Nanobody, 127 residues
Framework: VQLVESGGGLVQPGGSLRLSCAATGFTLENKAIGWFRQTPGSEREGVLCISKSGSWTYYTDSMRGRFTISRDNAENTVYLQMDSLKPEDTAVYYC??????????????????????WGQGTQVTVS
């Protein structure tokens, strides 16, 4: 079982990107998927999580309206849309899911430490 990311890229400020988190081997409909960003030499930080029941938990307190999240069950994929991109958004982005924690988003530190599957990471650069 694995989580596969894509949709990264490099755009000017003001652009937008949509990241995807695709599951092979299991159905995301019953799980919570959380997104995190990291730059080398700094700790991961939560962005946004969608629970099994579909609630959105914002780990970040910055620019909440720019980040949106959706689940496509037909494709077994979760999407993170990022609008109005700024240079400070440049980072590697990861999705993650937990088997423990039972479909809840928790908070950012808890979810990241509990996570049992990680995406491979995708580069987002705003220049």
């Amino acid at each position: 079982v694995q989580l596969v990311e894509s949709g990264g890229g490099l755009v000017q400020p003001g652009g937008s990107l949509r990241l995807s988190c695709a599951a092979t081997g299991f159905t995301l409909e019953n799980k919570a998927i959380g997104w995190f960003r990291q730059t080398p030499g700094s700790e991961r930080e939560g962005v946004l999580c969608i629970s099994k029941s579909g609630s959105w938990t914002y780990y970040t307190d910055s620019m909440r309206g720019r980040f949106t999240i959706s689940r496509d069950n037909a494709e077994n994929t979760v999407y993170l849309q990022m609008d109005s991109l700024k240079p400070e958004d440049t980072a590697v982005y990861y999705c993650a899911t937990t088997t423990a924690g039972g479909g809840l988003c928790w908070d950012g530190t808890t979810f990241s430490r509990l996570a049992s599957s990680w995406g491979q990471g995708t580069q987002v650069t705003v220049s």
